[PDB]
Amino acid sequence: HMGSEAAQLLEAADFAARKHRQQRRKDPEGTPYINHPIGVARILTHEAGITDIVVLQAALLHDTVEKTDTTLDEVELHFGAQVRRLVEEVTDDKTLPKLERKRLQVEQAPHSSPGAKLVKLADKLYNLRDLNRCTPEGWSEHRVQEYFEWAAQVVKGLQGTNRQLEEALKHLFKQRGLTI
Amino acid sequence: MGSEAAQLLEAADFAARKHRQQRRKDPEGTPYINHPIGVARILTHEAGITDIVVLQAALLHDTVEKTDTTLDEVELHFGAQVRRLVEEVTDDKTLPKLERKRLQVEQAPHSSPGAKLVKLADKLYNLRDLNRCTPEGWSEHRVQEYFEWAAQVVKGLQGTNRQLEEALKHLFKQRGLTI
Ligand SMILES: Nc1ncnc2c1ncn2[C@@H]1O[C@H](COP(=O)(O)OS(=O)(=O)O)[C@@H](OP(=O)(O)O)[C@H]1O
Ligand SMILES: Nc1ncnc2c1ncn2[C@@H]1O[C@H](COP(=O)(O)OS(=O)(=O)O)[C@@H](OP(=O)(O)O)[C@H]1O
Ligand SMILES: [Zn+2]
Ligand SMILES: [Zn+2]
């Protein structure tokens, strides 16, 4: 039947909102986690100039398989194979120890699809801004700076995708003595 | 203002940040932002609504009423038409609760069609939530009383959207209420 991008976008936002409903950010105030995927998708439309509905849905859904009770077939059933494939690309293996997770992001970055690179860039940009705004509960200042150092290693492999996101990230890295 | 997707994410992000410290009354304390998102999703997924102004107003319909949001802030980000719709659906919170509910019944039939769509989906989400899980501290009579008052509001909203009104009619009938 006749669809619309507006309806498709709200499908993904509502899906993510229910999937993340019990989860919270790590700021002291414990912001509802759903604010993060919403803000990641909004970075893509408001700053990066992206309108691709598949990319925007994946941005709203990018942490669902990683962090919630969500399967790949569930994503494909609601949003199609292209969205599922994109969510698959940006989904970390939560069963690895933290260090191996982070190393894989660095290695996987250059061979990411353009859509996956956009999601990964906006994901990093949101979290780096969140760190700069407010040191998370349980994150030492050392851990924050280490996260920027690692994020620069990841963003290094994502470059050449979006001028606005990469210019923004380069400025935030430069403020912390990082080039990449 | 860009694409329709950009305008929806502007309103969803705006609403998410305004309701960031607010939770629903279910025992799990669901983030409040799930409610306006679900109300907007009712409009697109069940009611067939594609009017971007109505969908933004649904995402924003509780911001002025419940959060630190001014009318000028809404119009600054979303324009006069969205602001005017949000105005229409904004309850006076300074009234006692009985008076608040009285006013919704009074104001129902003379709302604009866009405001009637938002109010219908708002009611449908809340009644479905009540059927899903009784709010913390609510007795069964208070749940039934909410349905009885909601039916008085919906009676004034009728003639707006067949899909929304047929669904509300079913939920009312199951509880012995005829609209
Ligand atoms: N307040 C705040 N600021 C920044 N980041 C926050 C916050 N709360 C939670 N998060 C989420 O923490 C994720 C990064 O955590 P870690 O470095 O410990 O692990 S990992 O990088 O995901 O492997 C990162 O996960 P991803 O979104 O999957 O990248 C963030 O979403
Ligand atoms: N779990 C759950 N189920 C149903 N409704 C819920 C829930 N959590 C919060 N709410 C919001 O409560 C509003 C109706 O509450 P009340 O009957 O006490 O009336 S009042 O708001 O105090 O005037 C009603 O406000 P409105 O959205 O303005 O209609 C609901 O949004
Ligand atoms: Zn993320
Ligand atoms: Zn509401």
Curated annotation (Swiss-Prot), chain B:
InterPro entries in the record: HD/PDEase_dom, HD_domain, MESH1
Question: What does the UniProt entry list as the effect of changing E65A?
Answer: Abrogates ppGpp hydrolase activity
Q: Does the UniProt entry include the keyword Nucleotide-binding? A: no
Q: Name one Pfam family in it.
A: HD_4
Residues binding Mn(2+): H35, H61, D62, D122
User: What functional role does this protein have?
Assistant: ppGpp hydrolyzing enzyme involved in starvation response.
Q: Which family does it belong to?
A: Belongs to the MESH1 family.
Know the name of this protein?
A: Guanosine-3',5'-bis(diphosphate) 3'-pyrophosphohydrolase MESH1
Show the taxonomic lineage. Eukaryota, Metazoa, Chordata, Craniata, Vertebrata
> Source gene?
HDDC3
